[PDB]
Short mmCIF file of all heavy atoms in Angstrom, two decimals:
data_model
loop_
_atom_site.label_atom_id
_atom_site.label_comp_id
_atom_site.label_asym_id
_atom_site.label_seq_id
_atom_site.Cartn_x
_atom_site.Cartn_y
_atom_site.Cartn_z
N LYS A 1 285.01 145.78 159.68
CA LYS A 1 284.84 146.58 158.50
C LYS A 1 284.74 148.03 158.87
O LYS A 1 283.88 148.43 159.69
CB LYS A 1 283.65 146.14 157.71
CG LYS A 1 283.68 146.75 156.29
CD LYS A 1 282.62 146.02 155.42
CE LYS A 1 282.74 146.52 153.98
NZ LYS A 1 281.71 145.88 153.08
N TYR A 2 285.59 148.90 158.30
CA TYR A 2 285.68 150.26 158.69
C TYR A 2 284.85 151.17 157.87
O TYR A 2 284.60 150.96 156.64
CB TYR A 2 287.15 150.78 158.57
CG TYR A 2 288.19 149.92 159.39
CD1 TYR A 2 288.79 148.88 158.81
CD2 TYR A 2 288.35 150.25 160.80
CE1 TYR A 2 289.73 148.10 159.65
CE2 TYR A 2 289.21 149.47 161.58
CZ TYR A 2 289.87 148.41 160.96
OH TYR A 2 290.75 147.65 161.74
N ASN A 3 284.33 152.27 158.51
CA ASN A 3 283.50 153.26 157.86
C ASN A 3 284.26 153.95 156.75
O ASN A 3 285.49 154.22 156.94
CB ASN A 3 283.00 154.31 158.86
CG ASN A 3 282.27 155.51 158.27
OD1 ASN A 3 282.95 156.44 157.84
ND2 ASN A 3 281.01 155.37 158.09
N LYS A 4 283.64 154.18 155.63
CA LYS A 4 284.25 154.79 154.44
C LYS A 4 284.82 156.17 154.63
O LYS A 4 285.92 156.49 154.15
CB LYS A 4 283.38 154.80 153.24
CG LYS A 4 284.03 155.09 151.97
CD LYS A 4 283.04 154.93 150.72
CE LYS A 4 283.79 155.18 149.44
NZ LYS A 4 282.88 154.92 148.31
N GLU A 5 284.16 157.01 155.39
CA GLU A 5 284.57 158.39 155.73
C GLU A 5 285.82 158.43 156.56
O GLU A 5 286.74 159.23 156.40
CB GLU A 5 283.50 159.24 156.32
CG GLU A 5 282.37 159.54 155.37
CD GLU A 5 281.25 160.35 156.01
OE1 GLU A 5 281.40 160.67 157.24
OE2 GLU A 5 280.33 160.76 155.23
N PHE A 6 285.84 157.42 157.48
CA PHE A 6 287.07 157.26 158.38
C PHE A 6 288.28 156.89 157.54
O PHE A 6 289.31 157.37 157.64
CB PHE A 6 286.73 156.15 159.38
CG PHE A 6 288.03 155.62 160.09
CD1 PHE A 6 288.63 156.37 161.06
CD2 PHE A 6 288.48 154.42 159.75
CE1 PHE A 6 289.77 155.83 161.72
CE2 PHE A 6 289.64 153.87 160.36
CZ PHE A 6 290.25 154.63 161.35
N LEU A 7 288.05 155.93 156.54
CA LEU A 7 289.06 155.40 155.72
C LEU A 7 289.54 156.57 154.74
O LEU A 7 290.76 156.51 154.36
CB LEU A 7 288.60 154.19 154.91
CG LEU A 7 288.44 152.91 155.82
CD1 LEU A 7 287.83 151.80 154.94
CD2 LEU A 7 289.83 152.44 156.34
N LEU A 8 288.70 157.37 154.30
CA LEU A 8 289.06 158.53 153.43
C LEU A 8 289.90 159.51 154.12
O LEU A 8 290.92 159.93 153.55
CB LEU A 8 287.81 159.14 152.79
CG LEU A 8 287.27 158.42 151.60
CD1 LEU A 8 285.82 158.87 151.21
CD2 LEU A 8 288.24 158.70 150.36
N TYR A 9 289.55 159.96 155.32
CA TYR A 9 290.37 160.87 156.10
C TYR A 9 291.72 160.22 156.38
O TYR A 9 292.73 160.80 156.26
CB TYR A 9 289.65 161.31 157.43
CG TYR A 9 290.47 162.13 158.21
CD1 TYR A 9 290.53 163.54 158.17
CD2 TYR A 9 291.32 161.58 159.27
CE1 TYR A 9 291.27 164.31 159.02
CE2 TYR A 9 292.11 162.35 160.05
CZ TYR A 9 292.07 163.70 159.94
OH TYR A 9 292.87 164.44 160.79
N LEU A 10 291.64 158.97 156.86
CA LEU A 10 292.84 158.28 157.30
C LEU A 10 293.86 158.08 156.22
O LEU A 10 295.07 158.24 156.41
CB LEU A 10 292.49 156.90 157.92
CG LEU A 10 293.61 156.12 158.49
CD1 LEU A 10 294.46 156.98 159.50
CD2 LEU A 10 293.06 154.82 159.15
N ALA A 11 293.36 157.80 155.00
CA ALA A 11 294.27 157.66 153.88
C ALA A 11 295.01 158.90 153.59
O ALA A 11 296.16 158.89 153.23
CB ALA A 11 293.40 157.26 152.61
N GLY A 12 294.30 160.04 153.74
CA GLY A 12 294.96 161.34 153.58
C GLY A 12 296.06 161.60 154.65
O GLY A 12 297.13 161.99 154.23
N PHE A 13 295.78 161.23 155.86
CA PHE A 13 296.70 161.40 156.94
C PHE A 13 297.89 160.45 156.84
O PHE A 13 298.99 160.76 157.28
CB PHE A 13 295.99 161.31 158.28
CG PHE A 13 296.81 162.05 159.40
CD1 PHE A 13 296.68 163.41 159.51
CD2 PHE A 13 297.59 161.28 160.25
CE1 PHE A 13 297.42 163.95 160.59
CE2 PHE A 13 298.25 161.86 161.21
CZ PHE A 13 298.15 163.22 161.44
N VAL A 14 297.65 159.31 156.29
CA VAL A 14 298.62 158.29 156.05
C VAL A 14 299.57 158.69 154.90
O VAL A 14 300.79 158.64 155.10
CB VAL A 14 298.09 156.93 155.80
CG1 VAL A 14 299.17 155.96 155.28
CG2 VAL A 14 297.38 156.32 157.05
N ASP A 15 299.04 159.11 153.83
CA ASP A 15 299.81 159.63 152.69
C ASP A 15 300.71 160.82 153.13
O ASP A 15 301.77 161.04 152.48
CB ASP A 15 298.90 160.12 151.55
CG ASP A 15 298.54 158.98 150.61
OD1 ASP A 15 299.25 157.94 150.58
OD2 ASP A 15 297.49 159.08 149.88
N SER A 16 300.36 161.50 154.17
CA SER A 16 301.05 162.69 154.64
C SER A 16 302.07 162.44 155.78
O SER A 16 303.29 162.62 155.59
CB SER A 16 300.06 163.82 155.03
OG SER A 16 299.19 163.29 156.08
N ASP A 17 301.56 162.02 156.91
CA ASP A 17 302.42 161.74 158.10
C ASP A 17 302.66 160.27 158.38
O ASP A 17 303.25 159.91 159.32
CB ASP A 17 301.79 162.39 159.34
CG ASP A 17 302.17 163.84 159.42
OD1 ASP A 17 303.10 164.34 158.71
OD2 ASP A 17 301.38 164.59 160.16
N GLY A 18 302.10 159.43 157.51
CA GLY A 18 302.21 157.91 157.73
C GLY A 18 303.34 157.27 156.98
O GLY A 18 304.04 157.90 156.24
N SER A 19 303.46 155.96 157.29
CA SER A 19 304.55 155.20 156.58
C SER A 19 304.19 153.70 156.42
O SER A 19 303.71 153.12 157.43
CB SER A 19 305.87 155.32 157.27
OG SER A 19 306.97 154.71 156.61
N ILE A 20 304.45 153.21 155.29
CA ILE A 20 304.26 151.68 155.03
C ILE A 20 305.64 151.06 154.75
O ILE A 20 306.19 151.27 153.78
CB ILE A 20 303.31 151.47 153.84
CG1 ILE A 20 301.94 152.00 154.21
CG2 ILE A 20 303.28 149.96 153.49
CD1 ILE A 20 300.89 151.77 153.08
N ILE A 21 306.05 150.34 155.74
CA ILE A 21 307.41 149.85 155.84
C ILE A 21 307.62 148.30 155.72
O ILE A 21 306.89 147.58 156.40
CB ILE A 21 308.13 150.31 157.18
CG1 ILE A 21 307.81 151.80 157.40
CG2 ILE A 21 309.60 150.03 157.11
CD1 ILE A 21 308.33 152.29 158.78
N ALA A 22 308.50 147.88 154.80
CA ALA A 22 308.83 146.48 154.68
C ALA A 22 310.36 146.32 155.02
O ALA A 22 311.11 146.98 154.34
CB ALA A 22 308.47 145.97 153.34
N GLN A 23 310.68 145.37 155.88
CA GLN A 23 312.02 145.24 156.22
C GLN A 23 312.43 143.76 156.16
O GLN A 23 311.68 142.80 156.35
CB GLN A 23 312.25 145.74 157.75
CG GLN A 23 312.04 147.14 157.83
CD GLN A 23 312.16 147.60 159.25
OE1 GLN A 23 311.16 147.74 160.05
NE2 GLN A 23 313.40 147.85 159.75
N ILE A 24 313.73 143.54 155.85
CA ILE A 24 314.29 142.24 155.86
C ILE A 24 315.29 142.17 156.98
O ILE A 24 316.37 142.90 156.96
CB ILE A 24 315.06 141.93 154.57
CG1 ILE A 24 314.14 142.11 153.32
CG2 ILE A 24 315.66 140.56 154.55
CD1 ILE A 24 314.91 142.13 152.00
N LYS A 25 314.98 141.36 158.05
CA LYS A 25 315.87 141.37 159.22
C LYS A 25 316.62 140.09 159.35
O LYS A 25 316.07 138.96 159.07
CB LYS A 25 314.94 141.59 160.50
CG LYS A 25 314.08 142.87 160.43
CD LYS A 25 313.61 143.29 161.77
CE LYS A 25 312.85 144.54 161.68
NZ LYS A 25 312.59 145.16 163.03
N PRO A 26 317.93 140.25 159.69
CA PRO A 26 318.79 139.10 159.88
C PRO A 26 318.41 138.21 161.02
O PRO A 26 317.96 138.71 162.10
CB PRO A 26 320.14 139.69 160.27
CG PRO A 26 319.87 141.06 160.72
CD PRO A 26 318.60 141.46 160.03
N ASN A 27 318.41 136.91 160.80
CA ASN A 27 318.00 135.92 161.85
C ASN A 27 318.70 134.58 161.72
O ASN A 27 318.36 133.82 160.79
CB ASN A 27 316.50 135.75 161.87
CG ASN A 27 315.91 134.92 162.98
OD1 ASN A 27 315.02 134.09 162.77
ND2 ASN A 27 316.59 134.96 164.14
N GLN A 28 319.60 134.32 162.65
CA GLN A 28 320.43 133.08 162.57
C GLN A 28 319.62 131.83 162.85
O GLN A 28 320.11 130.72 162.54
CB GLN A 28 321.55 133.19 163.59
CG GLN A 28 322.45 134.44 163.38
CD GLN A 28 323.13 134.44 162.10
OE1 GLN A 28 323.68 133.47 161.57
NE2 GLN A 28 323.18 135.68 161.44
N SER A 29 318.36 131.99 163.31
CA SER A 29 317.56 130.76 163.69
C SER A 29 316.67 130.32 162.59
O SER A 29 316.14 129.20 162.62
CB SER A 29 316.83 131.01 164.98
OG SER A 29 315.79 131.97 164.73
N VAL A 30 316.48 131.23 161.52
CA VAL A 30 315.55 130.97 160.50
C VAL A 30 316.25 130.31 159.30
O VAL A 30 317.41 130.41 159.23
CB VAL A 30 314.81 132.24 160.10
CG1 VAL A 30 315.71 133.06 159.13
CG2 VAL A 30 313.49 131.95 159.43
N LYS A 31 315.43 129.59 158.49
CA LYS A 31 315.96 128.83 157.40
C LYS A 31 316.89 129.58 156.49
O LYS A 31 317.99 129.10 156.12
CB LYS A 31 314.78 128.33 156.57
CG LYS A 31 315.13 127.50 155.37
CD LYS A 31 313.99 127.05 154.53
CE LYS A 31 312.89 126.30 155.36
NZ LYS A 31 311.78 125.78 154.52
N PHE A 32 316.47 130.85 156.03
CA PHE A 32 317.32 131.56 155.01
C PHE A 32 318.02 132.67 155.74
O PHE A 32 318.39 133.67 155.08
CB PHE A 32 316.40 132.08 153.91
CG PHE A 32 315.72 130.98 153.13
CD1 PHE A 32 314.43 131.14 152.72
CD2 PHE A 32 316.42 129.88 152.79
CE1 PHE A 32 313.83 130.06 151.98
CE2 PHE A 32 315.85 128.83 152.07
CZ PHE A 32 314.54 129.01 151.58
N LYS A 33 318.31 132.60 156.98
CA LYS A 33 319.06 133.52 157.73
C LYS A 33 318.36 135.03 157.78
O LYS A 33 319.01 135.95 158.34
CB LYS A 33 320.48 133.65 157.24
CG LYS A 33 321.17 132.33 157.12
CD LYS A 33 321.32 131.67 158.47
CE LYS A 33 322.01 130.25 158.29
NZ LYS A 33 322.17 129.62 159.68
N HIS A 34 317.29 135.10 157.22
CA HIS A 34 316.53 136.39 157.25
C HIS A 34 315.03 136.29 157.40
O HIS A 34 314.43 135.34 156.83
CB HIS A 34 316.85 137.18 155.84
CG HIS A 34 318.33 137.57 155.73
ND1 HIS A 34 319.18 136.88 154.99
CD2 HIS A 34 319.05 138.54 156.36
CE1 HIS A 34 320.37 137.38 155.04
NE2 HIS A 34 320.29 138.37 155.85
N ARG A 35 314.42 137.25 158.10
CA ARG A 35 313.01 137.26 158.28
C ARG A 35 312.46 138.52 157.69
O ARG A 35 313.14 139.52 157.57
CB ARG A 35 312.68 137.13 159.80
CG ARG A 35 313.45 138.13 160.64
CD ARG A 35 312.91 138.22 162.08
NE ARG A 35 311.62 138.91 162.11
CZ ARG A 35 311.18 139.50 163.24
NH1 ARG A 35 311.87 139.51 164.35
NH2 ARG A 35 309.96 140.09 163.14
N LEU A 36 311.09 138.56 157.56
CA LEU A 36 310.43 139.71 157.03
C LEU A 36 309.55 140.33 158.08
O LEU A 36 308.94 139.69 158.81
CB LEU A 36 309.58 139.44 155.82
CG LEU A 36 310.31 138.85 154.57
CD1 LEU A 36 309.30 138.73 153.42
CD2 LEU A 36 311.52 139.62 154.25
N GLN A 37 309.60 141.69 158.08
CA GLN A 37 308.68 142.39 158.98
C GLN A 37 307.96 143.60 158.27
O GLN A 37 308.59 144.35 157.63
CB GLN A 37 309.41 142.99 160.21
CG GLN A 37 308.52 143.80 161.10
CD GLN A 37 308.92 143.66 162.59
OE1 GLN A 37 309.97 143.23 162.95
NE2 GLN A 37 307.94 144.00 163.42
N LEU A 38 306.69 143.53 158.31
CA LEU A 38 305.80 144.56 157.67
C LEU A 38 305.24 145.44 158.74
O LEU A 38 304.79 144.95 159.76
CB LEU A 38 304.75 143.98 156.85
CG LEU A 38 305.02 143.03 155.70
CD1 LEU A 38 306.24 143.50 154.86
CD2 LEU A 38 305.29 141.52 156.19
N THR A 39 305.28 146.79 158.51
CA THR A 39 304.83 147.73 159.48
C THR A 39 304.05 148.89 158.98
O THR A 39 304.56 149.54 157.99
CB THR A 39 305.97 148.27 160.32
OG1 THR A 39 306.68 147.22 160.87
CG2 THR A 39 305.46 149.15 161.43
N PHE A 40 302.87 149.10 159.45
CA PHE A 40 302.05 150.33 159.18
C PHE A 40 302.42 151.33 160.32
O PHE A 40 302.27 150.96 161.46
CB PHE A 40 300.59 150.03 159.12
CG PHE A 40 299.71 151.26 159.05
CD1 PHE A 40 299.63 152.07 157.90
CD2 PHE A 40 298.98 151.65 160.11
CE1 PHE A 40 298.87 153.18 157.82
CE2 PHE A 40 298.13 152.76 160.07
CZ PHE A 40 298.10 153.57 158.98
N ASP A 41 302.85 152.54 159.89
CA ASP A 41 303.27 153.50 160.87
C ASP A 41 302.66 154.85 160.66
O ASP A 41 302.56 155.30 159.51
CB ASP A 41 304.80 153.64 160.67
CG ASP A 41 305.44 154.48 161.75
OD1 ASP A 41 305.05 155.64 161.96
OD2 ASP A 41 306.42 154.04 162.38
#
């Protein structure tokens, strides 16, 4: 569990220089030929 002040500053820096990324990646070995990858950046 993270400190609230840390989370408040971090949210600001994330909204600015950060990225929340969701990707659909091709994969011949998986059931539906595609996999999901989520990334906090």
Side-chain angles (χ1 to χ4, degrees):
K1 195 166 186 181
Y2 303 95
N3 173 272
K4 191 173 183 179
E5 292 181 355
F6 164 77
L7 289 173
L8 273 165
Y9 174 91
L10 184 53
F13 200 81
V14 168
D15 273 338
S16 59
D17 280 341
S19 188
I20 294 178
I21 312 173
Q23 297 175 265
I24 306 167
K25 307 203 178 188
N27 183 217
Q28 305 297 318
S29 69
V30 80
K31 183 185 301 187
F32 297 141
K33 310 296 177 176
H34 297 102
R35 51 167 287 202
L36 300 189
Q37 177 145 20
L38 301 319
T39 306
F40 170 72
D41 187 308

